[PDB]
């Protein structure tokens, strides 16, 4: 129990932090990855002067603060502001003292060696956690779907990745990163919806375009004869009621937004798209392992939640793969937390105890120890 209860799992994202206790089924804490700094001197009624704001208080009060994102494209870019988000996570969100809890953290696919050593330096030397561990994100997603070999298409708020994993070892030279994700996708909907003849003028109009994207957006299979369908004008249309009455209608654009993930050309991106990239990762891997990867395309991440994403991907890679092959696109329902759940499982596991980096290992080996 000492640490059975006690292991923490913190998944640091570009848009959201997911956090909680190893053992739980889902994150106890989910909140924006921002750190707000007040543009002016003054106070809220009853509070003192605050130097900084994090998560939702930074979002809610955004009009008087300069908002900053510590993690650009999955990589920690500002370490002063990240130590601020961690502090908030332990002390306010989970309300635990960190110096008696083992902490499993996550990093990104080709996270620079030096960063994995730096967050270890900050975990052990400024938070004084007993022990910690850094798992790679795609690797926890895979594992949370039971398996050990597969290829994960991972897509969240600032990055998309393909991480081919074989008997647990993520394959460095076959990993692909596509910098277009849910953030890019909300801003494109924004324009095709103002372009539908609308105005997201106040900040209460801006924010909810993102809630339109999440609730009403679709990834149609045969996106071709779906536009064609749009035109005959079926009961395909969908009206959402705004903060007030102002019933906005979205028929068609509803799927023009996730067609951006297959066609980056919709947004002036010259890069290849999700399905081709799944494939290219795969023809960059060893030959003998390619049947395995093809029958185990595990999806994880908030942006892979658009319904019919899996069917489109299913047919997208069947028709690029040699017919002798078995294609299989696994997309679980909890996928917006796969990464986290894979960490919860792993860290609560009976056999993981012997991989925890302890302060004994650290004080004796330097940050190098956990770096592997």
């Amino acid at each position: 129990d000492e640490d059975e209860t006690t292991a923490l799992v913190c998944d640091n994202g570009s848009g959201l932090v997911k956090a909680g206790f190893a053992g739980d089924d889902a994150p106890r804490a989910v909140f924006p990855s921002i750190v707000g700094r007040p543009r002016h001197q003054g106070v809220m009624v009853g509070m003192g002067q605050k130097d900084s704001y994090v998560g939702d208080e930074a979002q809610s009060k955004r009009g008087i603060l300069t908002l900053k994102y510590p993690i650009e494209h999955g990589i920690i870019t500002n370490w002063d502001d990240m130590e601020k988000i961690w502090h908030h996570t332990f002390y306010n969100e989970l309300r635990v003292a960190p110096e008696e809890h083992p902490t499993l953290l996550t990093e990104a696919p080709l996270n620079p060696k030096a960063n994995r050593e730096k967050m270890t330096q900050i975990m052990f030397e400024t938070f004084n956690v007993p022990a910690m561990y850094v798992a790679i994100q795609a690797v926890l997603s895979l594992y949370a779907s039971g398996r050990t070999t597969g290829i994960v298409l991972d897509s969240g708020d600032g990055v998309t990745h393909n991480v081919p994993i074989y008997e647990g070892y993520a394959l460095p030279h076959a990993i692909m990163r596509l910098d277009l994700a849910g953030r890019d996708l909300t801003d494109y909907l924004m324009k095709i919806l103002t372009e539908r003849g609308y105005s997201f003028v106040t900040t209460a109009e801006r924010e909810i375009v993102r809630d339109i994207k999440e609730k009403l957006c679709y990834v149609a299979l045969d996106f071709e004869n779906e536009m064609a369908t749009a035109a005959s004008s079926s009961s395909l249309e969908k009206s959402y009621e705004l903060p007030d009455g102002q019933v906005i209608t979205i028929g068609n654009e509803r799927f023009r937004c996730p067609e951006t993930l297959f066609q980056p050309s919709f947004i002036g991106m010259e890069s290849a798209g999700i399905h081709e990239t799944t494939y290219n990762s795969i023809m960059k891997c060893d030959i003998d392992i390619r049947k395995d990867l093809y029958a185990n395309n595990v999806m994880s991440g908030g942006t892979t939640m658009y319904p019919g994403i899996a069917d489109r991907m299913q047919k997208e890679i069947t028709a690029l793969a040699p017919s002798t092959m078995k294609i299989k696109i696994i997309a679980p329902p909890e996928r917006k937390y796969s990464v986290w759940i894979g960490g919860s499982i792993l860290a609560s596991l009976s056999t993981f105890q012997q991989m925890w980096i302890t302060k004994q290992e650290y004080d004796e080996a330097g940050p190098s120890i956990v770096h592997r």
Binding site: K215, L221, P307, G308, D311
Partner: protein, 55 residues
């Protein structure tokens, strides 16, 4: 096989569109039922305040 599997992506598609609309309509019924005890409660109070002020 192509026919059982095709009949399928369509039945599972329909199942998920119907589960999505029931989740949305149940969220809407809970919100309109909660707007309610509130509308009706301040009502018992506004009508009582009237009978006292009229007196």
């Amino acid at each position: 096989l192509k026919d059982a599997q095709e009949k399928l992506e369509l039945a599972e598609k329909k199942a998920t569109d119907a589960e999505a609309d029931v989740a949305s309509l149940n969220r809407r019924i809970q919100l309109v039922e909660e707007e309610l005890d509130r509308a009706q409660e301040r009502l018992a109070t506004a009508l009582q305040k009237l009978e006292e002020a009229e007196k």
